[PDB]
Design a protein around this ligand. Structure first.
Ligand SMILES: Cc1cc2nc3c(=O)[nH]c(=O)nc-3n(C[C@H](O)[C@H](O)[C@H](O)COP(=O)(O)OP(=O)(O)OC[C@H]3O[C@@H](n4cnc5c(N)ncnc54)[C@H](O)[C@@H]3O)c2cc1C
Ligand SMILES: Cc1cc2nc3c(=O)[nH]c(=O)nc-3n(C[C@H](O)[C@H](O)[C@H](O)COP(=O)(O)OP(=O)(O)OC[C@H]3O[C@@H](n4cnc5c(N)ncnc54)[C@H](O)[C@@H]3O)c2cc1C
Ligand SMILES: Cc1ncc(C[n+]2csc(CCOP(=O)(O)OP(=O)(O)O)c2C)c(N)n1
Ligand SMILES: Cc1ncc(C[n+]2csc(CCOP(=O)(O)OP(=O)(O)O)c2C)c(N)n1
Ligand SMILES: [Mg+2]
Ligand SMILES: [Mg+2]
Lengths: 546, 555
């Protein structure tokens, strides 16, 4: 069997079901074999960076059940993937990257030249620091096992991206078809700490939410009445609930941060407790609590926040080994969770009442109007992203998606293409004016493929998050996003008022379809709450619930 | 002195005079220090990839006399630079890259974690394989000497890109100001080469990328012309060579039929800084210049005795060669006039429109560019695809004109942002030619052209296809072109230009093209032309591979 046909077969048999590409000579055999088999849907995009973001959104939107694929040619194709690869690496989402390479006999090998073949570039050397596995196939007999290995590595433990570099001659070669075809005492210790806490709280992180069994385990936590907060990456997958206080940290809800600083036991499930979660005083994190941290990765234990008790456990195993129903029922906790609900009621409010359009009002309207609609949100990077992270309260079949660790602007629009294809559901993008520019060209794909993606551009005529902290502001100069959308054949609307916003959103939900909204937000250049001056996480600005 | 202020001073004192950035928290101190000194002009762009291509165009448009700078924040800023870095690496153009990093005490170091600080990413590890020098500053006392070293390394020998990664705390540190202020050539080899030239009946030069940006090249070429010796060039050499009766054009797969004829009939080929890669020689390097003895001069031992094994190979840096060897010391051979007349005639009869049955001939479009811009100082920037090779073949540069290609890397999306750098540093109008595919990648930088009122004409040759690959798929996959052709579906480039506030025009005919060019040349200003070219999906001549370079198709 032809090697490229074997690659197509292996991808489809291992749940790599959606791929994204910009073509080049060195991947024609792969693309052709994939399209012919027709089990993996391959979508053409205008920039391999866009392809990489779309591919990453496949595992994101399917909660790691299905993997994405990005294909690129050697040289500039491979170098164009890199931002996306790095996002998958820093947020631990699985994704497959295949680069086509020049013929093995055209490689420079060890010769002291910068390149030998046309458009030759070693992609492995570029991505070794940001992948779980990166290898260039040397002989056609390595291809099948190495691809199977790479896919297994992407998915396993702490997930992430993998890359195989495949010389064109190997793609065309024949392969052999026949050869193709925890301590119970630790668990108990944690239970006992939970049982005896007067004010327990979970911190749900990125390591928890995409691990098998998570939502069923959380249902049992709710049955026991234990409240919780989440990191940005945990928050992506958590439905709104009275026991869920929202995201913690610098931009987190005042209520979530209050809970963290007043709990007597904090159980941290797969969170790095990085500077965005803790602020500049990790010593002060959960100051009234004993902290338990569970993580698969020893290096992420005893790091910034030194937990009182640290356990190296993979979380899907933890969830199958520990039912929260084994925690004795405790009615002391009702007073605590009532206290937190009331804190949320009184502090989860509009802090932008003197702005022309409040971000809190916009996101409150999204929460309300989409209550019975299965859709996901994709966020870009900037103040706009944090407006969303704070205020989005996800309804039953809704997730939101962020570039958290890397924080790459330009993620959202192309990611929405992948999310829509793999999630088979409408998508709402929120992006800022700066971030919208980077992969604006992929609006063409949204139009071409008639995808039900609503793109909301929150235009504050500034690179807002850095402007607050010459190179971020141009005296009100801005691009015409409504006109850019229309130029790309996407129905577009200028949104000046809450009525216009609400009407446009209703229209989209009634008849999902390519739509772009340019929201005029010149006075909206900060987040409230926010954390300043090295302060504790329960001292967000504006001061005192400000 | 504040470290970032020192960095600003050092850049300006070493001819790093134009920079391009997308801001981030970890480069605010560097950007502020640069703007406050005001000797290096820093221009904001929408994508660090665009910034990188723009920065690269600074040395390109100034023939390596002035260097460009791209600044980016750690993490996605740095990863967005990479395509531009790789272009500078494979085409050997000098350029400085500075990335701002998290505070030294927030780095992950050797801890087994993927990151520690917010947006922390090791940029050095990403670019070590595609730079001459890449280093992360560890102590503020290293910054000044390392930056000076990096700039030196970028410029020297075979040029290229360098990167320094600078932690924010180091940018804010004090440095000591007072301290801030504080093989051989053989004559016998030169003579041997002179003797080979003087006794050749049919001499030819191959002028490569290593020659044309080396100091003294144009004055040396003037003397070659005085002696009446003809020459061809690689794509990278062709960037900088003025049209002349002795210059037969670019050689190779897409080169002129006349240039390829000259190479295969000369009796001595003197190769000056060319790799003689597959695009120059085709698939039979053993047949390259079959009637000639070949002399190759290169700085890099690894690029000698490589694909084409020269009869005589010399490791010499070309600026030294050009000073050590005046072509005036070659005696004229009396057979040369017959040979150069033969080649001029070959050029006359073969440098011809091969697309007479197309609605718009690329050859006609580029010959109109040659004619209409005859007395105008401007540069061309090309993207990647059939459109790029139409330009490489047919452009005949007038006196103060150059063209610029992504040759080794061949990165689509180069042209539009490169034009921004070229325009700023070259202080001259720029004409971009890009295909419909290539135009998309960094389309967002049209906004910068409009914002800054730059005299850049963007010509989109829209054949509704990813043409150069579409042909590959026709010939080898039985017409299965779903990833290069979408049944005529296309973007509206005229409307996209207008949306970005760039005056735009649809161009259907040669008259419209000519009128629009005349308008641009009369009043240079942001302008976009969408040229409708649905039937234009191949290059002629081309090499259908395996064949010798003098049997291009169509035959
Ligand atoms: C502009 C901006 C502002 C931000 N503001 C905030 C903010 O205010 N608050 C906030 O929370 N974030 C914020 N972020 C996001 C932040 O940078 C981090 O991306 C995020 O907080 C990390 O979440 P995490 O540690 O839960 O998940 P990850 O980064 O995914 O870390 C996962 C952790 O769990 C472990 N793990 C993974 N899989 C498993 C498994 N199977 N079993 C066991 N352990 C596992 C890993 O080893 C690691 O320790 C911001 C980002 C940006 C760009
Ligand atoms: C779509 C496409 C089609 C192409 N078609 C063609 C084609 O038809 N014909 C063609 O010619 N190219 C073609 N190219 C370009 C090709 O890929 C190479 O980029 C090009 O041929 C390299 O030219 P070069 O070797 O002269 O320059 P470089 O790649 O820059 O190599 C420079 C050489 O000179 C040496 N050198 C550098 N500086 C010095 C110095 N100071 N002193 C001494 N030696 C020095 C280097 O060591 C090296 O060997 C194409 C590219 C693309 C993207
Ligand atoms: C590729 C990249 N370069 C730079 C940054 C740094 N940065 C963080 S937020 C931000 C501003 C984003 O502005 P915009 O998209 O308009 O959003 P706003 O903050 O205004 O809502 C920038 C430049 C980034 N995250 N990604
Ligand atoms: C970034 C990048 N990805 C992929 C390729 C491979 N490739 C070479 S030419 C080409 C098609 C170019 O299409 P277009 O820009 O429309 O030019 P045309 O050949 O049709 O004139 C592609 C995809 C490339 N060179 N650069
Ligand atoms: Mg903004
Ligand atoms: Mg095209």
């Amino acid at each position: 069997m032809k090697a490229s046909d074997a690659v197509a077969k292996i991808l489809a048999d291992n749940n790599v079901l959606y791929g994204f590409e910009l073509i080049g000579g060195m991947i024609t055999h792969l693309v052709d074999s994939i399209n012919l088999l027709g089990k993996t849907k391959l979508v053409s995009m205008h920039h391999e960076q866009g392809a990489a973001f779309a591919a990453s959104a496949v595992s994101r939107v399917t909660h790691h059940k299905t993997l994405g694929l990005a294909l690129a040619t050697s040289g500039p194709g491979a170098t164009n993937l890199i931002t996306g690869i790095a996002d998958c690496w820093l947020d631990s989402h699985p994704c497959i990257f295949l680069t086509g390479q020049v013929n093995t006999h055209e490689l420079k090998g060890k010769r002291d030249i910068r390149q030998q073949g046309f458009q030759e570039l070693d992609s492995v050397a570029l991505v070794t620091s940001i992948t779980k596995y990166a290898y260039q196939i040397k002989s056609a007999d390595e291809l099948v096992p190495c691809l199977r290995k790479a896919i297994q590595i992407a998915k396993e433990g702490r997930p992430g991206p993998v890359l195989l570099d495949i010389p064109m001659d190997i793609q065309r070669a024949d392969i052999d078809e026949a050869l193709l075809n925890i301590a119970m005492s630790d668990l108990d210790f944690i239970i006992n700490k939970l049982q005896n806490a007067k004010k327990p709280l979970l911190l749900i992180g990125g390591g928890a939410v995409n691990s098998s069994g998570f939502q069923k385990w959380l249902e049992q936590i709710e049955l026991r009445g234990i409240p919780y907060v989440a990191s940005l990456k945990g928050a992506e997958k958590i439905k709104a609930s009275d026991l869920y206080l929202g995201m913690l940290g610098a931009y987190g809800t005042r209520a979530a941060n209050h809970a963290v600083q007043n709990c007597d036991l904090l159980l941290v499930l797969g969170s790095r407790m990085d500077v965005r979660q803790t602020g500049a005083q990790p010593e002060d994190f959960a100051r009234n609590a004993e902290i338990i941290q569970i993580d698969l990765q020893e290096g992420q234990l005893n790091n910034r926040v030194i937990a009182d008790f640290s356990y190296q456990i993979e979380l899907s195993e933890y969830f199958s080994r520990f039912s929260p129903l084994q925690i004795p029922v405790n009615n002391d906790w009702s007073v605590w969770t009532a206290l937190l609900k009331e804190k949320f009621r009184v502090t989860f409010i509009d802090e932008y009442t003197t702005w022309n359009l409040s971000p809190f009002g916009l996101f409150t309207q999204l929460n309300k109007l989409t209550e019975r609609v299965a859709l996901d949100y994709i966020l870009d990077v900037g103040n706009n992203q944090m407006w969303a992270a704070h205020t989005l309260r996800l309804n039953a079949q809704q997730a939101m998606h962020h570039s958290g660790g890397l924080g790459s602007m330009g993620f959202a629009i192309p990611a929405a293409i992948g999310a829509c294809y793999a999630g088979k559901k409408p998508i709402i993008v929120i992006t800022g004016d700066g971030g919208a520019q980077l992969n604006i060209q992929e609006l063409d794909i949204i139009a071409r493929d008639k995808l039900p993606i609503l793109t909301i551009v929150m235009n504050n005529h500034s690179l807002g998050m850095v402007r607050g902290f010459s190179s971020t502001y141009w005296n009100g100069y801005t691009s015409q996003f409504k006109k850019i959308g229309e130029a790309y054949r996407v129905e577009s609307k200028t949104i000046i008022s809450m009525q216009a916003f609400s009407s446009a959103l209703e229209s989209f939900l009634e008849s999902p379809r390519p739509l772009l909204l340019e929201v005029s937000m010149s006075d909206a250049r900060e987040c409230r709450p926010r954390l300043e001056y090295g302060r504790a996480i329960d001292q967000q600005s504006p001061r005192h619930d400000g």
